Amino acid sequence: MLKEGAKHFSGLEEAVYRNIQACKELAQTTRTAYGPNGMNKMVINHLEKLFVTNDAATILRELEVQHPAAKMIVMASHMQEQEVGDGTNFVLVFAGALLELAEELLRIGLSVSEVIEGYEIACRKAHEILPNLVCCSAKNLRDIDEVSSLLRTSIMSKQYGNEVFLAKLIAQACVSIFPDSGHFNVDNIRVCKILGSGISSSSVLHGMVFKKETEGDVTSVKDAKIAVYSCPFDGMITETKGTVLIKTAEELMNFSKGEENLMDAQVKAIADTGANVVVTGGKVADMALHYANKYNIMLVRLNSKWDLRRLCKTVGATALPRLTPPVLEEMGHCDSVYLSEVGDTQVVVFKHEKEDGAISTIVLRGSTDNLMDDIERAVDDGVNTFKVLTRDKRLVPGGGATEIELAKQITSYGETCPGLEQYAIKKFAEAFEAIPRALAENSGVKANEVISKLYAVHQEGNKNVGLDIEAEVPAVKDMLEAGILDTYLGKYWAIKLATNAAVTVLRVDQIIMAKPA
Amino acid sequence: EVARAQAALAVNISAARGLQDVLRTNLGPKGTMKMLVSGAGDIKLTKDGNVLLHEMQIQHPTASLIAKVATAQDDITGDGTTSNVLIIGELLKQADLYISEGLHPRIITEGFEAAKEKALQFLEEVKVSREMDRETLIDVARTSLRTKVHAELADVLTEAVVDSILAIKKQDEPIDLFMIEIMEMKHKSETDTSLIRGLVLDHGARHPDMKKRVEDAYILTCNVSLEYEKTEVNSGFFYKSAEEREKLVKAERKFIEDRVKKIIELKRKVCGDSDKGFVVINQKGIDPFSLDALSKEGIVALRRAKRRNMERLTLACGGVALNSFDDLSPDCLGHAGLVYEYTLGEEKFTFIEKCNNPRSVTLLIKGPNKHTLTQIKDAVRDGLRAVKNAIDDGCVVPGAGAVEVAMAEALIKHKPSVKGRAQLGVQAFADALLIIPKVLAQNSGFDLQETLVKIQAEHSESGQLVGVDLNTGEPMVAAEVGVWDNYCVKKQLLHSCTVIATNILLVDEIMRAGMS
Amino acid sequence: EVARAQAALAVNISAARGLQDVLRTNLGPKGTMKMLVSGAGDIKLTKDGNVLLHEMQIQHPTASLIAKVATAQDDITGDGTTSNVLIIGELLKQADLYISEGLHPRIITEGFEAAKEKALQFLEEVKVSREMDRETLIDVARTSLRTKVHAELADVLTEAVVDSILAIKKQDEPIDLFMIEIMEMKHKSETDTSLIRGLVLDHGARHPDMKKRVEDAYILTCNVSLEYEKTEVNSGFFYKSAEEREKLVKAERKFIEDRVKKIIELKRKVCGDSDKGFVVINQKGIDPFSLDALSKEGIVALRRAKRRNMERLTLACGGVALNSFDDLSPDCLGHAGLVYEYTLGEEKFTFIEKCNNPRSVTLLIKGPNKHTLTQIKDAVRDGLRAVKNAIDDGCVVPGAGAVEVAMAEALIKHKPSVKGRAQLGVQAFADALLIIPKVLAQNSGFDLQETLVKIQAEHSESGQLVGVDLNTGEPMVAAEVGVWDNYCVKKQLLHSCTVIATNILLVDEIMRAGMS
Numbered sequence A: 001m002l003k004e005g006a007k008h009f010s011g012l013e014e015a016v017y018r019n020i021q022a023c024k025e026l027a028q029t030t031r032t033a034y035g036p037n038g039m040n041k042m043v044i045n046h047l048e049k050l051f052v053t054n055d056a057a058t059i060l061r062e063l064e065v066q067h068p069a070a071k072m073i074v075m076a077s078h079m080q081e082q083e084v085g086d087g088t089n090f091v092l093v094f095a096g097a098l099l100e101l102a103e104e105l106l107r108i109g110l111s112v113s114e115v116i117e118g119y120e121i122a123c124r125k126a127h128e129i130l131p132n133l134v135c136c137s138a139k140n141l142r143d144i145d146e147v148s149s150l151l152r153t154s155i156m157s158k159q160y161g162n163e164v165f166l167a168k169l170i171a172q173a174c175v176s177i178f179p180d181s182g183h184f185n186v187d188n189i190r191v192c193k194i195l196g197s198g199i200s201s202s203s204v205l206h207g208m209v210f211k212k213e214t215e216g217d218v219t220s221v222k223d224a225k226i227a228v229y230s231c232p233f234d235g236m237i238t239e240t241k242g243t244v245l246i247k248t249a250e251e252l253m254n255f256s257k258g259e260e261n262l263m264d265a266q267v268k269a270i271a272d273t274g275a276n277v278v279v280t281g282g283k284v285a286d287m288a289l290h291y292a293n294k295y296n297i298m299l300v301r302l303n304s305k306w307d308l309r310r311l312c313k314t315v316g317a318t319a320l321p322r323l324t325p326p327v328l329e330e331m332g333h334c335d336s337v338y339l340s341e342v343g344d345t346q347v348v349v350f351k352h353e354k355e356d357g358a359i360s361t362i363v364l365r366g367s368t369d370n371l372m373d374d375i376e377r378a379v380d381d382g383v384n385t386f387k388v389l390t391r392d393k394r395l396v397p398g399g400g401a402t403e404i405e406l407a408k409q410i411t412s413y414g415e416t417c418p419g420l421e422q423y424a425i426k427k428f429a430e431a432f433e434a435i436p437r438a439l440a441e442n443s444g445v446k447a448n449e450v451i452s453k454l455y456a457v458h459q460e461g462n463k464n465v466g467l468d469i470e471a472e473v474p475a476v477k478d479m480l481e482a483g484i485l486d487t488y489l490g491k492y493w494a495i496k497l498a499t500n501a502a503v504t505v506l507r508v509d510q511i512i513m514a515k516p517a
Numbered sequence B, C: 001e002v003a004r005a006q007a008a009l010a011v012n013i014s015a016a017r018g019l020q021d022v023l024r025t026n027l028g029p030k031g032t033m034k035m036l037v038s039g040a041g042d043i044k045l046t047k048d049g050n051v052l053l054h055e056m057q058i059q060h061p062t063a064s065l066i067a068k069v070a071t072a073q074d075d076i077t078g079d080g081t082t083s084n085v086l087i088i089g090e091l092l093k094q095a096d097l098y099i100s101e102g103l104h105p106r107i108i109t110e111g112f113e114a115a116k117e118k119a120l121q122f123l124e125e126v127k128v129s130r131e132m133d134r135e136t137l138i139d140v141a142r143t144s145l146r147t148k149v150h151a152e153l154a155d156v157l158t159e160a161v162v163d164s165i166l167a168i169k170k171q172d173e174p175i176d177l178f179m180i181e182i183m184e185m186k187h188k189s190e191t192d193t194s195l196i197r198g199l200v201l202d203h204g205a206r207h208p209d210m211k212k213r214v215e216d217a218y219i220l221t222c223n224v225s226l227e228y229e230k231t232e233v234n235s236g237f238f239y240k241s242a243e244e245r246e247k248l249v250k251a252e253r254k255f256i257e258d259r260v261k262k263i264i265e266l267k268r269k270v271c272g273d274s275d276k277g278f279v280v281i282n283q284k285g286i287d288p289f290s291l292d293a294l295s296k297e298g299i300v301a302l303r304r305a306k307r308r309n310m311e312r313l314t315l316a317c318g319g320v321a322l323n324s325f326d327d328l329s330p331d332c333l334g335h336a337g338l339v340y341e342y343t344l345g346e347e348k349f350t351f352i353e354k355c356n357n358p359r360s361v362t363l364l365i366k367g368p369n370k371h372t373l374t375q376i377k378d379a380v381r382d383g384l385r386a387v388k389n390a391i392d393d394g395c396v397v398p399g400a401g402a403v404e405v406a407m408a409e410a411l412i413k414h415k416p417s418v419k420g421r422a423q424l425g426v427q428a429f430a431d432a433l434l435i436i437p438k439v440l441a442q443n444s445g446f447d448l449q450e451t452l453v454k455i456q457a458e459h460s461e462s463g464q465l466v467g468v469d470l471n472t473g474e475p476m477v478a479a480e481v482g483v484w485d486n487y488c489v490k491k492q493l494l495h496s497c498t499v500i501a502t503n504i505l506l507v508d509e510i511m512r513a514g515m516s
């Protein structure tokens, strides 16, 4: 009319309408998960493989939204993912509940400044009262079952069938390097995929693990310097066709002898300069393997971009895809390279640990390539959850037993200070009842009776609804002795990011115009 | 082709009312923010008046021309583009109502000019002086930050601004806003500010861990080819023979060796110990084999330097930029007192301070890696502009909506002359000045007429400058809290409003012609 | 069925503005007349307010209801239906503007009531008395005739009206407008008026040319059957035998002969000369053979008399109406002083005057045989009503637009209280009272704001009641020319306007229901 060119529908009326419906529709396609349930969703983009996923991270990473209100939350989601390990759907659910509860306050007839002030006061009160429900704590990280219980509790959120063997393997792989005290890195653990048997035959191994065959000889010396290259066995001599049937044998024999002499001089110069082995990334030839066998030089076969990228980012060399024989400028720190036979396959093992910065690589094996993705996701999630950078994790009884207590505390605190700030406090307290409802609705029973039962027992804060059929209607269980706890800092960061996103959404709300060319 | 009616004035009044109603919710500290996105999905957050008016798509030519005229008058004072369209729209509505009632635009223009002259005389007679110190500038910067940024980090910003102003201003001539560089970084926190009293160098050295406690240092700026590239070159044209290019490469290597030997002997002559350091700035690369031999004796050399860095270095210290490494007079070597190396991110920064004539202050700010850093920079720039405007003069009048009420009372009651034709315009000009307190009370969250009549009764009973409170809606005095303003800003705003309202009512007919 | 908006007030304001714009060019003596024709082509000229509002076809129900309410309050004073819709429309427009700005109708109603009370107090304190004589009534009648009829024949009617008022009023009790009969005739000229001090009889005698100089005459009113018809009758039922009806006719003739002999002997007994005359009034016919014998002795008998004629004769003189012609007491015979016979047209009229207690004045008017005679009659009736209204009281305030200016000045300047909410309504009530002088200046042919500010300056410099001149547009004093007004008329107009403006803004929603 005066600013927009019949593109958007913004103005002095979409404040309590279009700016909330988009977020509601975005969060509606996410409440189906959140909990140990089988709600797989197929993802079809560009790979054209038809794979089903369960986590919301891969679902949100493939969906393309064209709305600023929906794009204002993916930034906070990525920030929370970069900060701590888990935590993604909680922020979205909290923001959706806050928006749905503020829609009524905006429709009644209240300004946004009072609502923002009340939300900030409620968030400050929740942050102040949060360090008060600490029950269990981490004792010694040098044991096995102490971290195995936490790993099992973290894995049970994803996979429900098998969760003990994977947790034990992750614990054994993490305890063989360095604990949380001192310094512990994350990009020092690699996951390899082996197409063979099922998942009931996995093992662990310290050092580098790569599925690369060897058609030469076993070189177990320390002077075998590595030499990575792009495509050294490509084609230094391009041969063409003269006639149709065949040409003269003299020219072909001369060209073959010249190429053989050239490659012999090349391998002699590359072996006499201080490099016994060579990393190739091309094809093979009969004379090539013959020279590699008669010169005692290890020759690989399998080539991959990820392998050379990891070798470059770990050692620090540089591939030289040149025709003329260059000089030795790829000196690294590796020296102990051994060969092993695993699953009738030849694997390499690198030994260069000096009790500092050790690496590990767990051996994984499955049926198809569409099943190891969830295993790798669970493994990396458990690895990220194990890192907390503190000796005492100060675990709290998660699963919804603390949300009701926090809501009751906020409700009891709000019924004291007079003024027009009680409605926002009551809304922030009632918004905390969105975690048990989503967990009860995704099981098979209702959620009103579960909430009534949870509010009718006692204010102990250690009661939550179970997962079996004998724990849906009563929902009276003690999760303190079972071993179901959550991260203390994770919930705090999630609440902080949700409050920040809600404040940013409620602030920027007026007229959405365009920009001139 | 042929048109003889009054639809032009009607559509002009309609466009003015539309432009006034579009932008009217951005007044006062409790204003609502806006957003702009169109180019490849770039989310931009702003709240200023000129920044919004400069980056918008208006479908009306009259509104576009009005916005252009309003933006073309912002380069005089600091920030006066806001709180101007409302008074113009009110005056245009009053003029349209008086025309529909039955009058001539000439009498309206004469009355508007008389009212403008009376308001100028009242503002000149009501002004008052005040001794400029530290609390006044602190309050001015705090108000300028509150009118732009939220009331959370409006403390370390104004403190740093006042510190930089006190460190820069020390003479009698008017200061210049060209010696203060505002840089930006990328961190994880939000509130992170720093006031560096020296220069900032982005690049450093490729071989760190050698020394950093260099007190007295000599800096020399040059532009010779020390180590550009190891690739063979000639004269920008490829050849066929390799002997010539290899001889040229050997000659270049011999020249580089001669140059490094010359600078080594120069460092050994002008120093000879470890206290007096020698820092070299060069835009070309540095070979590590030569860098090690240089650092073995106690001279550091930096590579990859920008033009602005060496410009600021030669402007603050005072050195001659030559293209030779010969043994010349040490008069062009600048002195540095303290050098520090800050390691953060993927590149180490260099901070040089304790130099001669400290006339270079850096206001470093860090953000959470988003687009709010540009908003913080614009806010601190507006604050610096307001501080500079509040330091050139010596008279500061109170604000908070306490100048328009007295102006209207003086224009309505104490009439300069007795004339109905002049009063018909004086009343219209006085009734349009009350658009600021009403809009402020509406945006604060209270009534519009109750607070107005309360302020009127308070001013009629007491007689002082009564302001508007944005907390309880009660009439209070703005001369004891801390709300202040400027002097020439109000005069420029009144002049612009009168100029805009004058050259609008004289529009006769609008024909459809033209080709260019 | 379901409606929750504010369109009802909008359409009400629109209908009020339309009704105000439709009727607004009929104010002042220099107005434009109107014509109405629809039924069988009947041309009717009018210019009054109530006569127009009572005979119109309004398509809007709200306007029709407003007109009905305005006409229902016209039977109180003389003529106050005009100059009322303009102030109501102005007040409604001000209320709609204040509602669109943001206010409540309760505060507006309270302010309107306060302004009405202040105006009533000012009118009660500004009133002044004046001795009632002949010049004041003459000027009042002249102003009424000028406001009703043109400035031509407005000089021959005011004198007759004043003479009739002076002849009728002679006691202390309030006079009554029921003893003055306004008759009409048909002539060729236009300006022809007469003031008869006696009664008027339309019919006369069938045999004229006998006598007309009858001084002291005796009039006797009866209703016996003297000569109804020569046709044979019985008892309202036809029969078959002719002997019975012929005997009845013979008996009726004998009774008529006996009655005429009895009245002849009565006239001979009560008189016996030619000076003492006798006049008989009868509604039945008179035979010429008996009329000749009656006139031979000196007694006139009239035939075909109306009921109102004999009613006025028995009410002014005082006679008993009997149904017999016997010899009774002469106490019921009325006395007549002078009898005259006017011969004009196709029927001779009788004028009786010089009787006892002259309390019957006739205002005979003539026209050029058209429809303007009814307009002249309505104008003289309005003049008589204004004269009667100006004779009941003893205080007359000046007019010509000299009371609304002082009222507005007292309501704006000398405020009764200090309150913004009350002032918001006081200003709206005071700004709606200046529509009468503006409309008068617009209809006179001059400007609207120039004369307004001139009158304002003249009232502010001097301090007397300044009127509006309809000749040169210059401010003059209406207290020395001859322009006057009433007292209770202004109070009734203010009360009606307040009642109308009060019960309008309280309209919530208008639903579509009802069956009856």
Ligand SMILES: Nc1ncnc2c1ncn2[C@@H]1O[C@H](COP(=O)(O)OP(=O)(O)O)[C@@H](O)[C@H]1O
Residues within 6 Å of the ligand: A034, A035, A036, A086, A087, A088, A089, A090, A156, A157, A158, A398, A399, A400, A484, A486
């Ligand atoms: N076996 C379990 N018993 C009880 N609660 C569980 C179990 N597994 C997961 N949860 C609950 O489900 C919630 C969501 O877990 P998870 O999916 O790991 O995080 P996110 O939803 O942020 O991705 C957690 O707050 C946790 O309390």
Ligand SMILES: Nc1ncnc2c1ncn2[C@@H]1O[C@H](COP(=O)(O)OP(=O)(O)O)[C@@H](O)[C@H]1O
Residues within 6 Å of the ligand: B026, B027, B028, B029, B079, B082, B083, B143, B144, B146, B147, B148, B399, B400, B401, B436, B468, B470, B483
């Ligand atoms: N601290 C304050 N308290 C009350 N009102 C203020 C304060 N600071 C500014 N204002 C009001 O804000 C108005 C101008 O705000 P704005 O249009 O944003 O320009 P600026 O940013 O230059 O103040 C002024 O009319 C003034 O009355």
Ligand SMILES: Nc1ncnc2c1ncn2[C@@H]1O[C@H](COP(=O)(O)OP(=O)(O)O)[C@@H](O)[C@H]1O
Residues within 6 Å of the ligand: C026, C027, C028, C029, C079, C082, C083, C143, C144, C146, C147, C148, C399, C400, C401, C436, C468, C470, C483
């Ligand atoms: N002689 C006069 N000179 C000037 N104005 C007059 C005169 N007589 C009447 N008016 C004006 O006419 C108005 C009323 O006229 P009108 O509505 O026709 O009613 P009326 O016929 O009773 O006067 C009054 O407001 C008065 O100012």
